[PDB]
């Protein structure tokens, strides 16, 4: 109102009478709202101190005067260098007391209203129910609104004061998260914005997250996820993303039914990225991948993949798609009508290693989807021949190695793409990195499934190279397992058997590691050595004498000791 | 006589299908026929393979997939 | 009598040395021919190879074969090349600034 910049004769009335406490508070408020005279108010003495003194013990019978706690010290709190003076009067301490008191009073009001909503048995529009209830209901509103305002501004002060880690620690040591989760139950847009922003700020820390784990927080965010406010949805989604780093909260999200809501948020909004991130974090757990096919709309996810025109597909979408492709149930949905065809066409056109990762994950499964890959063997083989870096070649090799179709012709594929010298050269000691060598081994194993290629594999010299690689990689279980599987594949073809048995010492290596510590290695070696039992009578004698000597090794060494 | 002949032929087949001739004759050399109880004493009979397997409680407690996701390292701590 | 003696001798050696599993395998694979009056055997790869073995998924417990080089590079390098899944490394949403300077 009419408040000149002078500041005396208004604080004198601030500690003289109760009806005029609010008048002086509002008069000071008008000045505090203008930042130009904030300095003059700051250097004023016996003015802010009187405000703090009046606040300290006269806030339990005012509510209106409790808007000098904040909107004055909120005005001081919007600027950082003033914060210290705010903490000189311990104003942040009174705000927590006020917030807890208001939350408790609201719970009492709600209990009273629920008790007054019990006489609905007979309607009489008198002191029994209805009329009188309506009265108190109106009163409830007339209070709650005011209280909510206070809460809002009080919380704002604390939020501004939480920019310092020490002060945030002091707040959390006083159970601020409990107050925020309790305040989540209210129906007010701005207050919910403030509470959820405060929670998102706090949740980056482990102890605050643990506090909001026990005070169930997802059950109070599901009721706000489909909300009509734009900023509230955004901030709630950011808080959900921060909370989705915990396994327990992630498991709770699927129990409360957040998957369909998050995927509805995935259709076309300003929340595609954050909802996709939360869904990606949810899908890293294996039992939650299947439920994305259950009604969860993943067809739309293919549309986002196909329409997104750029050299590279965005990392969030491609990562989520790669995770989804690890489930056979999802793969059936991906490869419906023409889904694999378009994906393959796009990954061949634009060399996208991540899209090729998705295709490899699709090819890992052994239904009709594997039979869908017969038209792309040559397409992948063209890229395999060391033309497109190494991240794209490795995925093409991995996808081709997954095509274990029992009647596929690999002889023509090897003949035209001349891919057999390249595979041989990748078995050199210092040719390429270990992952490419391993996938070359898996390629050789898959190719050996065809009898017509057997002779081609005999004259190439792949078997001695694999023996040298097995010698050099004897400390890797994966490498030895895959090499022995290649041997198991190429025994029963009448052409590589002769090389394996008569020409190479591979059975000697198989004997020496038949009883390995690894079950897979043992199983593959055992199955291979049953093939060599009959095609050679000396190797059968060796396979007997060994493993009888090994089975009873202590009994045979006990003569020495 | 006929039934015991058939089952000794079975046993011959077993030992020829697992034990080689050199080890068979070594085991024959390291066995004794004792009359007081009337049985074949095998030197260091306790340290044969079957008893050693019976002595090993192979079944152990394997752990969860070493490749699990654990994103809790991203959360900060005070001070 | 010496016949039963050598019987129990071979029972003793079978008990000590021959494993149970291979023992029942060779019983299941034995067949007594009366015409030649002796025991015969059967092959292995000719009986099986109808249900040809499937490639091991991984010898290290992964979803796909995984080299040790990829294991070491997965722990330090954030490159997606060494990972079958979970190729994104998301970070927390840091709080924004609410206070001015003026």
Numbering used by the authors:
A (entry chain C): 129 to 689
B (entry chain A): 580 to 658
C (entry chain B): 574 to 675
What wording appears in the published article?
Heterotrimeric kinesin-2 (KIF3/KAP3 in mammals) is one of the most widely expressed and abundant kinesins functioning as a complex of heterodimeric KIF3 motor (KIF3A/KIF3B or KIF3A/KIF3C) and the armadillo repeat (ARM)–containing adaptor KAP3 (16–18). Notably, the tumor suppressor protein adenomatous polyposis coli (APC) has been identified as a KIF3/KAP3 cargo involved in RNA and vehicle transport crucial for neurons, accounting for ~12% of KIF3-associated organelles. Here, we present high-resolution cryo–electron microscopy structures of the heterotrimeric kinesin-2 complex (KIF3A/KIF3B/KAP3) bound to the cargo protein APC. Our findings reveal a previously uncharacterized KIF3 tail hook-like motif, termed the “HAC” domain, which mediates binding to both KAP3 adaptor and APC cargo.
To understand how the KIF3 tail interacts with KAP3, we determined the high-resolution structure of the KIF3A/B/KAP3 cargo-binding domain (herein referred to as ABK) by collecting an extensive cryo-EM dataset. The final model resolved the core region of the ternary complex, encompassing KIF3A (residues 574 to 658), KIF3B (residues 580 to 675), and KAP3 ARM domain (residues 129 to 689). The reconstructed structure revealed four interaction interfaces between KIF3 and KAP3, including two tripartite interfaces involving both KIF3A and KIF3B (herein referred to as ABK interfaces 1 and 2) and two additional interfaces specific to KIF3B-KAP3 interactions (herein referred to as BK interfaces 1 and 2). At the proximal tail region, adjacent to the stalk, both KIF3A and KIF3B form a helix–beta-hairpin–helix (herein referred to as H-βh-H) motif, which interacts with the C-terminal region of KAP3, constituting ABK interface 1. Within ABK interface 1, the highly conserved C-terminal helix of KAP3 binds to this hydrophobic pocket, primarily through hydrophobic and aromatic interactions with KIF3A. Following the formation of the ABK interface 1, the KIF3 tail extends further to establish a secondary binding interface, ABK interface 2, with the concave surface of the KAP3 mid-region. KIF3A engages in ABK interface 2 by forming a 310-helix, anchoring to KAP3 with five hydrogen bonds. Meanwhile, the proximal segment of KIF3B tail adopts both a 310-helix and an α helix, where a cluster of seven positively charged residues (Arg637, His642, Arg644, Arg654, Arg656, Glu658, and Asp666) facilitates electrostatic interactions with the negatively charged surface of KAP3. Beyond ABK interfaces 1 and 2, KIF3B engages in two additional binding interfaces absent in KIF3A: BK interface 1, a 10-residue segment following the H-βh-H motif in KIF3B interacts with the dorsal surface of KAP3; and BK interface 2, a five-residue extension from the distal KIF3B tail interacts with the N-terminal region of KAP3. The molecular dynamics (MD)–based binding free energy analysis revealed that KIF3A and KIF3B contribute ~28 and ~72%, respectively, to the overall interaction with KAP3.
